[PDB]
Amino acid sequence: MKKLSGGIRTALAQYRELAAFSQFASDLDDATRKQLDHGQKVTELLKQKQYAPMSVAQQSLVLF
Amino acid sequence: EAIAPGVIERQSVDQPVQTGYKAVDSMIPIGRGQRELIIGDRQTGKTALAIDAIINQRDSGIKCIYVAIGQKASTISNVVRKLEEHGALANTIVVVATASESAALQYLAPYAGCAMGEYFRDRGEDALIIYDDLSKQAVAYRQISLLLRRPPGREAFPGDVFYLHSRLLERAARVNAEYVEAFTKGEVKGKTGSLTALPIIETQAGDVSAFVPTNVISITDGQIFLETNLFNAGIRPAVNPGISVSRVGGAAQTKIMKKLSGGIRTALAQYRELAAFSQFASDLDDATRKQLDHGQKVTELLKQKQYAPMSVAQQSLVLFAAERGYLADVELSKIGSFEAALLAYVDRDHAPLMQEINQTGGYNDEIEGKLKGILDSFKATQSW
Amino acid sequence: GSLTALPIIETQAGDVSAFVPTNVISITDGQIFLETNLFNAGIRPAVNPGISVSRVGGAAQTKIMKKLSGGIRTALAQYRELAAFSQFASDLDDATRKQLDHGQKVTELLKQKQYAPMSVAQQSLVLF
Amino acid sequence: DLDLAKASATDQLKKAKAEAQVIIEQANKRRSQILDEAKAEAEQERTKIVAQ
Amino acid sequence: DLDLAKASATDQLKKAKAEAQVIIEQANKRRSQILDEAKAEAEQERTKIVAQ
Amino acid sequence: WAIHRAAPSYEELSNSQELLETGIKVIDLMAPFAKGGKVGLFGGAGVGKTVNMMELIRNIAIEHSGYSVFAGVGERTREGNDFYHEMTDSNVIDKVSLVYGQMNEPPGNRLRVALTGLTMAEKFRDEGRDVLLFVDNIYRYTLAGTEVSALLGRMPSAVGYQPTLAEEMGVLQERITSTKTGSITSVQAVYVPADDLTDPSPATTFAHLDATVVLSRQIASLGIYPAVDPLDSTSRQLDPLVVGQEHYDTARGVQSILQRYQELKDIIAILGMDELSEEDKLVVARARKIQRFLSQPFFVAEVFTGSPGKYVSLKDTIRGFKGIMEGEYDHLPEQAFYMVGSIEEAVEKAKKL
Amino acid sequence: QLDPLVVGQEHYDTARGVQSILQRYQELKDIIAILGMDELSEEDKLVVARARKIQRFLSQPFFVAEVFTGSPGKYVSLKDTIRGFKGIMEGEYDHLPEQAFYMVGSIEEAVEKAKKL
Amino acid sequence: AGAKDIRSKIASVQNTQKITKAMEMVAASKMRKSQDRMAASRPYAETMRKVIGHLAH
Numbered sequence A: 001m002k003k004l005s006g007g008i009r010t011a012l013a014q015y016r017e018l019a020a021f022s023q024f025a026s027d028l029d030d031a032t033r034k035q036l037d038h039g040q041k042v043t044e045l046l047k048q049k050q051y052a053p054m055s056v057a058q059q060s061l062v063l064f
Numbered sequence B: 001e002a003i004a005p006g007v008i009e010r011q012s013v014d015q016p017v018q019t020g021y022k023a024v025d026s027m028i029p030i031g032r033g034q035r036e037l038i039i040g041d042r043q044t045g046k047t048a049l050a051i052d053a054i055i056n057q058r059d060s061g062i063k064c065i066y067v068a069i070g071q072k073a074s075t076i077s078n079v080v081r082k083l084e085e086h087g088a089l090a091n092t093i094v095v096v097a098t099a100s101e102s103a104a105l106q107y108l109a110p111y112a113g114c115a116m117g118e119y120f121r122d123r124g125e126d127a128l129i130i131y132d133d134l135s136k137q138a139v140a141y142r143q144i145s146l147l148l149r150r151p152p153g154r155e156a157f158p159g160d161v162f163y164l165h166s167r168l169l170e171r172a173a174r175v176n177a178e179y180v181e182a183f184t185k186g187e188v189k190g191k192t193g194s195l196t197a198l199p200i201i202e203t204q205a206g207d208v209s210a211f212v213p214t215n216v217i218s219i220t221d222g223q224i225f226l227e228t229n230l231f232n233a234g235i236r237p238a239v240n241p242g243i244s245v246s247r248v249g250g251a252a253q254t255k256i257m258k259k260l261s262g263g264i265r266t267a268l269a270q271y272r273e274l275a276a277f278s279q280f281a282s283d284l285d286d287a288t289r290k291q292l293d294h295g296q297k298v299t300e301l302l303k304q305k306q307y308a309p310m311s312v313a314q315q316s317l318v319l320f321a322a323e324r325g326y327l328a329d330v331e332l333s334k335i336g337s338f339e340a341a342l343l344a345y346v347d348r349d350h351a352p353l354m355q356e357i358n359q360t361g362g363y364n365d366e367i368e369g370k371l372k373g374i375l376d377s378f379k380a381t382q383s384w
Numbered sequence C: 001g002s003l004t005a006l007p008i009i010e011t012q013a014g015d016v017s018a019f020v021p022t023n024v025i026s027i028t029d030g031q032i033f034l035e036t037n038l039f040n041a042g043i044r045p046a047v048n049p050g051i052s053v054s055r056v057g058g059a060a061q062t063k064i065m066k067k068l069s070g071g072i073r074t075a076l077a078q079y080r081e082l083a084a085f086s087q088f089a090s091d092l093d094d095a096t097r098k099q100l101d102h103g104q105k106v107t108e109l110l111k112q113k114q115y116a117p118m119s120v121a122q123q124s125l126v127l128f
Numbered sequence D, E: 001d002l003d004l005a006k007a008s009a010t011d012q013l014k015k016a017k018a019e020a021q022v023i024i025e026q027a028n029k030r031r032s033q034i035l036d037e038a039k040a041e042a043e044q045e046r047t048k049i050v051a052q
Numbered sequence F: 001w002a003i004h005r006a007a008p009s010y011e012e013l014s015n016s017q018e019l020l021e022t023g024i025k026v027i028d029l030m031a032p033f034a035k036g037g038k039v040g041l042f043g044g045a046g047v048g049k050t051v052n053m054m055e056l057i058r059n060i061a062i063e064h065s066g067y068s069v070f071a072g073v074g075e076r077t078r079e080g081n082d083f084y085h086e087m088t089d090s091n092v093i094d095k096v097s098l099v100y101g102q103m104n105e106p107p108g109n110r111l112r113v114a115l116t117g118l119t120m121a122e123k124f125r126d127e128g129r130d131v132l133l134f135v136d137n138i139y140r141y142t143l144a145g146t147e148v149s150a151l152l153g154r155m156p157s158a159v160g161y162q163p164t165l166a167e168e169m170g171v172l173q174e175r176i177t178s179t180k181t182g183s184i185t186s187v188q189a190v191y192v193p194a195d196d197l198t199d200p201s202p203a204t205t206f207a208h209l210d211a212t213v214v215l216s217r218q219i220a221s222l223g224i225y226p227a228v229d230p231l232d233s234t235s236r237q238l239d240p241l242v243v244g245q246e247h248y249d250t251a252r253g254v255q256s257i258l259q260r261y262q263e264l265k266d267i268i269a270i271l272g273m274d275e276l277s278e279e280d281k282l283v284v285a286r287a288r289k290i291q292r293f294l295s296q297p298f299f300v301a302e303v304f305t306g307s308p309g310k311y312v313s314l315k316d317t318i319r320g321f322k323g324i325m326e327g328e329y330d331h332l333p334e335q336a337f338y339m340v341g342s343i344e345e346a347v348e349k350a351k352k353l
Numbered sequence G: 001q002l003d004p005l006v007v008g009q010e011h012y013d014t015a016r017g018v019q020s021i022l023q024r025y026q027e028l029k030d031i032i033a034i035l036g037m038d039e040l041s042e043e044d045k046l047v048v049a050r051a052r053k054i055q056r057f058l059s060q061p062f063f064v065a066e067v068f069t070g071s072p073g074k075y076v077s078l079k080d081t082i083r084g085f086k087g088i089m090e091g092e093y094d095h096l097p098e099q100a101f102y103m104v105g106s107i108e109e110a111v112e113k114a115k116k117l
Numbered sequence H: 001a002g003a004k005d006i007r008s009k010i011a012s013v014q015n016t017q018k019i020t021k022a023m024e025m026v027a028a029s030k031m032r033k034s035q036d037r038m039a040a041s042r043p044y045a046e047t048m049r050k051v052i053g054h055l056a057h
């Protein structure tokens, strides 16, 4: 998990830095559109239902 | 200081109290025994709207009381001179505590006025009482309270600033005939007394969500909210529909007025909000176009001059002309003229029908037909 | 006899409307407002035109300076907003290009080393 | 066609010349009514002033 | 020619509308100018009787 | 006389409502004064407040038979000294009585100086005169009472003020009224804290002000003196029922003209002049003339303008503005109106131009 | 009590979808205020129109409020309301003017009111 | 809320107002230039249409 979470931190960091443009997404260059669309997806990935705990293997698998 | 009549001694407010203004008599009816907050910012016409209701009872048998708390002496002298100019003074009590007087006279004045009104209420008669500023009563009570080192609350007002207005406004009540009998030792049979209150509140910068304004909105049975943007735009009385309500609803209106009025007020609220988006552009643009034209002519029709009261008959037939078409052709520039002519014509010819609608609630298909006939007659043969 | 006073006040984040600052601005005859954005951007002394003023003004200024310094203050007050417009507008009208480059020359002229005071002769000559 | 244009001419002037006067007459009629109201009210308020 | 006749007709009606507006305007101005003089004279009469 | 006194009783007040002819065009048109009312003066600095005050003093001494009193509540000593001089060298010093309690004074002096000025103005009233009372800053009369109340240890109230704020303000503002014998008019400089018209002190003061004239740096920059802003100056005397219909609608006319011009001029600033419509060009050409005609030469300003000072009666201002707005005088240039006086002098200035 | 277990998956999902849409509409309210509605992406202009339709469909006439509005009250069963909101969200009523939804009991009454405008 | 957050938001809205006030002026100047470039384009088509008309019909 220490290995895998390093990339999640930076994906969400760049996404939070670019978020301002999410409202003007059509104007953006595709070189950043990929960063924004990867950020939105890693953000949609961290959603989870109540009383549904994941063992460390499943969390690591999904973050991979 | 007295405690208002209990829950069993009340009676539901039924009868109407007619102001002179189409706006409030149509959208915001006031019944005998109701309490109706007049709230707004400074210099928007509150005192005007209140003394125009006082003047209108000149002949309807409702004694009237006007208490001025914290006002300038010049304003009070002027208002007394107007009450005398229109003959109403012989029917009103004026209880005055000017801006110079002690904080203990300002704070105790409205209770004196209510004690003077309860005299009529308890004898089976009708009264109307106006508290010129229950915002300045709150300030004088805050002074008296802080001088006694009492821990203050929000906005430095004391804890019981709600109870102050509560035990006051809860006296404006309507009482059943048994209370009037038992009180008056049986001298008065079958009558029901009532005391109608119109407290006036002043709000800073139109902020309808401060402490004291909200307390009084939570104590009274409605509010007439006078907006400054409308008042500066020449719309007077600047009644803002969508924020002003009468929690006794139509039960307090005459049958004819209740019918012609209907949802007119929510209709104007819809029109006024639609104007917000239609300011730029709109689609569905014939139904929204006729909607806009109707609402606009209606607002141009609801404005009214100071000191010009008009009986329920005139308001009624003008609302008739407003609702049964009859106004699409005449321009925004002529609405005024349409009304002036209409009323002069009906005063000339159909004096009996006015004498009838003023004597009763007066609604029937017969009277609807009479009105339609007058409407087409004036509309075609009279040229205004 | 006379006694002039230069009281110094410190403000948080450049907020002038604090309590003590807005009292002392209401007591004195003027203020020299030192702007942090000009200071850290190398403009020193960071005197801010427009928001700084002297309410006795030219009445106390020496005649040569009064004559040679009439336009400077309002010229810079306008140039510093024209330079704020300039970022979003390239392809500027030559009419405004002249004004911008002149304002820039003068703004570069008024900065000064920390301990090199100038006599009225030198200041008037440079402003000439 | 010369016959028809003359007939139309005569008829159109027939309409316009008179209708100008009928509208001006409506104007004058409403003027009279409005002045009746004006004088009546300017008299009636004397009552309020004298009672004052 | 027909069309010249048509234009003269519409011009007559335009003039009639202008004159209707002008005459009713003057009639309302007269309403106000009469009522104001009546108001001021009745009020000075009040003042005289009161001083008496 | 003792400075602590009771306001005029209910049946001493004047049973009428007159107006005060200041003699200035802008004020008499856009913000008329009631005789015995309160007037706030919300201008800032460098706009001419002191010379406006001196012109009011001069006119109310000459063209009426009234005196004046100036109470210097809580302001810089420098301004007091240079006001004393600016008045001594214009011959109006013999027409005003000065009482000064300035920033360098203990709180009690700044508190009671306003009552001293007022109780001299009342003596002048009892002689039957119409008097004018200037207060140098009512906000400092509020703040001195706050300081004193804190010294006495009384509990604080709304936003740091004394609990008796409204009563302290009322027992002052309720003594300057028009009595059956005379009247005290008052022109009071008001300072709004933190640019907030809701703060308890401005909110308590505005309950008493009848008129309000706000001076503007802009209107001075264009060169028009006095520098009153016609769109922000207000008066609750502007009603047909008090001032008449012709004055009311003339003032509302010029107001609408100027407030349209204020945005036609921005449309010009962005799109250039000839983008306008021809109707709008006429609007601009009349608005510039009206805007020029609101200037006036004072008897006090001769030392700057050289032109002789003028006192313009109200009738003449109403005539001039009806004419300029009714399309008359469109045939003479806007500089024929500037700093002129009556319109019957604007025609004469255009004759020789 | 708003849990999948207690109220069923369909009810829970409709409620959460309504919340999501209304919140997404809240987030746009300031850009709409400054720059006008024409700057919103076509995907985000659909969100706004459905959000407003939902805002209006939550209104209902009450039997105790006839005294105010005159209109007769309505009683709407749960089965009948989760269906209407599923419809409005899924888009099956995405051709109907907003005012078709103001003060109506059930979606049927809205499609019926649209005939009268 | 709290004085500081609201003052920060006020500062940011004033900044937005500056940005839009600048974009308006830029767009106005570009509009003038882009309709000069529009006026310049007519003659070629205006004469080519005459030639084509004469030849065609």
Ligand SMILES: Nc1ncnc2c1ncn2[C@@H]1O[C@H](COP(=O)(O)OP(=O)(O)OP(=O)(O)O)[C@@H](O)[C@H]1O
Residues within 6 Å of the ligand: B041, B042, B043, B044, B045, B046, B047, B048, B049, B236, B237, B304, B305, B306, F236, F239
């Ligand atoms: N219906 C109306 N038409 C035209 N003018 C009106 C109307 N109602 C009020 N006004 C004008 O508004 C002015 C102020 O109104 P009014 O004094 O009643 O408001 P207010 O709230 O009592 O003021 P304050 O709060 O200072 O007492 C009045 O002088 C009156 O001329």
Ligand SMILES: Nc1ncnc2c1ncn2[C@@H]1O[C@H](COP(=O)(O)OP(=O)(O)O)[C@@H](O)[C@H]1O
Residues within 6 Å of the ligand: F044, F045, F046, F047, F048, F049, F050, F051, F052, F225, F226, F296, F297, F298, F301, F304, F305
């Ligand atoms: N009516 C006027 N005519 C000519 N100049 C004027 C007039 N009113 C003001 N000014 C000018 O405006 C300037 C402002 O001066 P001053 O009144 O001392 O400032 P403040 O009014 O802020 O105290 C003065 O120098 C004066 O020359």
Ligand SMILES: [Mg+2]
Residues within 6 Å of the ligand: B046, B047, B048
């Ligand atoms: Mg009032």
